[model samples]
Target: MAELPPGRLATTEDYFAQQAKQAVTPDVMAQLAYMNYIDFISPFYSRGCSFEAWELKHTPQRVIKYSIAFYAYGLASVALIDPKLRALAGHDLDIAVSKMKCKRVWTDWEEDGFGTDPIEKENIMYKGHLNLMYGLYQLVTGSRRYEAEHAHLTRIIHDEIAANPFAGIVCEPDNYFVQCNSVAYLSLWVYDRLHGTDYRAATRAWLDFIQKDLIDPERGAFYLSYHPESGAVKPWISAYTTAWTLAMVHGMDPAFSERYYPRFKQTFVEVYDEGRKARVRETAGTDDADGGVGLASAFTLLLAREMGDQQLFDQLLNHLEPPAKPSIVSASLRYEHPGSLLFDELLFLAKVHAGFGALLRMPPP
Candidate 1:
C-alpha cells in the first residue's frame, strides 16, 4: 500500500484532487447502484431538511447511526454534478449537523425504562461517536459551521479517556462494547485531524489496549465486548463485531489489519451456494437489526476495500447487485418503511467508502 499523506487534515479540495488522480473508478453499475440508493433514501428527508430517521422512528440512536449514513451519502453525492441532488444533500447535512448540535448527548432509552445515572449520562461513548460524523462533515464541506460543536464533543471524549482508570480503556457507560468504543477512538482520531491537534499518542495507546486486552487470544479475532475490570473477552463474539472492528481499526493501524485479516477471513467468510462469499455463524445467530444482512454484509465489503482485496470487494458487490428490473413498488416501500432501507444504507456506505476512500483521508499502505 502507498504511504498516506503525512500529518493530517488535508484540505477538502486537495483531498478531492488527490482522489481524482489516485482513486479507483467504481464499476459503473456500482456507481448507478449508489445513485439509485441516494434517490431511495432522499424521500426520508424531512421538510425541515433533516434526515428524518424514519426507519429508526426518530430515536436517540438515530442521532448516532442514521446521521452517519446521511453524511456518508452527502459525501458520495459530491461526486456527482447534479445541482439539485447536491443542494438537497447539503440541506439535509446542515440540518443533520444542527440536530447533532442540539442533541450533544445520547440519552434515549427504552420507552418504559428508568433514566440513566449521572455517570452513565457522562460516559460519552455513543454521544462522542456521533460527533465523528459531525467532524467529518466539517472536513469535507470545508465549513466552520460546527466548529464549536466539534470542539465541545471532542473535549468530552478526551476528558473521558483521561479520567478512565485504565490507560486507554473507553467503552459505553454500563456495557463494554469494544465495537462502539472503537468507533469512539476513531472519532478522536478524526477529531485530531480536523482540529490539527496531536492526540495520536493517546489514540495509539487506546489501540494498544485493545490489542492487549480486547482481542480473543484463542480465536485470534476480536470479541464482541470485554469485561472492563478483568480484561477478559466477553462470552459473545460474532461476525458483526469482527467486521466493525476491521472497518474502524484498519484505517488507524493497517499493520494490525494486515495480521487480523486472514484470521477473520478464515473464521467468518465461507463460500455459499453458487460460490458466493457469505459470512455465516459458528453457532446459531439470532436476527438482530444489523447482524447479518445489514452490518455484517457491509462490513465484509468495507474490510475487503480497506485491504485492497479487489477480488473480494467485487464478489461482495456481486451479492449486493440490485435487481435487473427496476421496481417502483419496492422503491416506494423502501421510501415509506425505514427498516427496509437499512440494507441499502449499508451497501451505500460500503460502495461509497470504497469508491471515495480518499475523501475519508483513508490511510495509505
Candidate 2:
C-alpha cells in the first residue's frame, strides 16, 4: 500500500505545530474574510428559507468557514498557551463575528438584516457559534470581556430549547439542523463553565429529543438535517455530520458520544485487502468516489481521540503522515475530500490533545 508504507506516525505535537502555525498565519485569517466570497455574481441574499444557499452547506467556504475559524483560533490559542496566539485568535474572532452579523452570511431569516444585535433574532446557529468563540477567548486569555457575550447566547439557546417546538433548535427560520443545534448545545455548556449558570435541564431535554426523534435506530446513524415545521426529514447519514455533532456532544456529554460512536463507526469505517487497506465511507456503507472518498482525518479522528480509540487515532495519523515529513496533517486533509480542509485543520488541531474540551477542565494559563 503506497498510502501506508507503515512508517512511524506523527505524534499529536507534530501535527499541532503545523496546524497552529497555519492558524497564526495571515492566510488563515484571510480565509475568514467575507470579501473573498463576494466575487460570486449571484444575487445578494433573498429572504427565503426554502431556497438553499450554498453558504449553510457542510462545506467550509462561508458560514461554516467562520465556525471553523472560530474553533481553530480558539483551540490553537489554548494549545499554544502562547498568549500571542490567544491575542491573534481574539482579533480574528472579532472580525469573523462582525462579518457574520451582517446579512452576508445567509439570507434566510430576519429579512431587513440581522440588525445591531443579530443574536437577538432566531439565529441560534450563529449565536451559538459566537458563544463558543467568546468562551474560548475567556478561557485562553483570562479576560472576561466576552462573558456577557457568552451569557446572552446561553439564554437564547436554553430558552429556545426549553420550549422545544420541533425538538431541535432553529438555525435559520424554518430549518433545524442536528449539526447546527449540536453547536448550540455545546456553546451553552461552555457558557455554563465560565458563568456558573446551570443549563442542565435545557441540555438534558434537547439531547433526549435527539435520542428519541433524530436517531435512526436501524441504521445507527443520525439524520443530519430536518425541517421541523414541514416534517421534511432528510433520511441521510453523514460521518461528517455525525462527527461534527457528536464531537461537540462528547465535550459536554461524554456518555452520549460514547453511546453512539461505535455504531456510527461501524457504519462508516471499514477495511479491505485483508486489513492492509483501511478507509472511511463518504456515505453510509458507500464510497461512490475513489477510495476513502472523503474523510476529515479519515473520518473524525477527534471522536476517536476523545472516545479513546487510540488505535484509530494512530492509524489516521500514520495514514496522513507525509513520505518522511510528519509536519502538517492539515496538508493531508487539503486534498479533494468531501469536506472542508480549512475546518478540518482546526478540528484535527483540537484532536492534538483533547485541548478543545479541556478548555473548561483546566485553568487558563
Candidate 3:
C-alpha cells in the first residue's frame, strides 16, 4: 500500500468514511486478535508500537516513544467494552498492564536506575501514560490486581507536581511541555477516584499556571514548552500540540477544558469543500504520510467529541483517517490496520468502541 499523496488524505472519501459509525461487534473481533498477538510473545519481549514492524525506522531511541504509547492507547481501546465483550476487554487490559511492567516498555527510565529515585529524574512522558492507563483499568474493572504498585506510582506523580520545584511535571529534566503535564493531571484525576483523594487542588494550581502564564496572551494558545525554574517559555507553538495538551486533561479541570476548547476550535480548526473537509492547523501543513498530523487530527476529534462540539466532530470525523494499511483480521470480514508504530489501530479502535476521550470519564461511582 503506497502512502497517501501529500495533503491527499484531506481530499479523499475512502479515508475515515463512516468508521466512527461502524458496528461495535466487528471491531471487538479485531481487538481480540490484537490481544492474542500480545500474549504470544509476552514476559520476555515488548515492542515499541501496536504494529511495531511497520514503523519506518527501527532505531531504539527513535522508536521508543511509542513503546509505552502502545500500552497506553491499547488499554484505553478496551475501557468501554460492550457487556457481551466485557470479559474479553477485562482480560486484554490485564495483558496490557502485565506487558507494561516488562521494563522494556519503559527503558528510557529503567536503565537509568529509576528504582533508586523515582521522582528526582523522572520520565513523566512514559510514567504519566502508564499511571493513567493503570488508573483507568482499575476504574473500569474494579480490580485490585495491580493496585499496590499503582497507588505508589500515583503518589509519585502527585508529589512531583503538587507544588514541586517546577510548575508541572518536568518530563525530561528542566523542560516541560504543557501537553505532557496535562497527562499527569489526568493521571491524578483517574487515580483519585480509586483512593478517594481530591487532587483538584493540585491539578487546579498546575492548570492555573498554564492558563495564566503559559498561554500566549495575544494568540491565545499554549507555549510549546515552559521552564518554571527559569520562567522561560518556548516560542512557535502549534495547534496540534495545543489541542493535544488541552484534550489530554480535557475535563479534569472543567473550567479549563470547557472554556479553552472553543478557542482552540476557532483558532485552529479548518473546514473546507463546502463542509466536506475538516482539519486542524497542524505545525506541519500536511504530513499525514509520516504519522504526524494524522494522529493529531485524530486526537483533535477526540477533543471535539468530548466538548460536545458535534458539528465540528462530524466535520472532521468524516474526513480524517489514520495513515496506515488495513489488512483483514484473518477469518473475519473485519479489517485491522496493524502498521504504523504510532498506535494508529489502537487509537482507531478506542475511538470507535469508546469515542476517543470517552475512556477518560469515570466508570460509574
What is the lDDT ranking, best to worst? 3, 2, 1
Q: Write the per-residue lDDT of candidate 2 for residues 18-108, one digit (tens) a residue.
A: 4445333332232222212333411112212221324433443344434444444345343454454555545544544444444545444
Against the reference, the lDDT scores of all candidates come to 0.51, 0.54, 0.57
On TM-score, the candidate that comes out on top is: 3
* C-alpha TM-score for every candidate: 0.70, 0.70, 0.75
Task: In model 3, state the lDDT of residue 359.
Answer: 62
Candidate 3 residue lDDT tens string, 104-222:
45666646545534334457777776677687767667789889878888877777776576567786667788877777777777776678788646876676678776786444477
Q: Count the backbone clashes (under 3 Å) in each candidate.
A: 1, 0, 0
Better of 2 and 3 by TM-score: 3
Full candidate order by TM-score, most accurate first: 3, 1, 2
CA shift at 194, candidate 1, in angstroms?
2.4
Residue pairs with colliding backbones in model 3 are none
Could you tell me how far off, in angstroms, the CA of residue 164 lies in candidate 2 after the best superposition?
A: 3.2
Residue-level lDDT tens digits of model 1 in 1-365: 12222221122223233334543223323333333345435433432434434434453453444445434543433433233344444554565555543333333532215244312343444454566666666645566877786787777667777887654434443456656666667777677766678654576777677777667644556766666566666665567677667767776777777787877776666545465334434312443323433455556766676576755665454444333121334223222333323454554455445332243463311
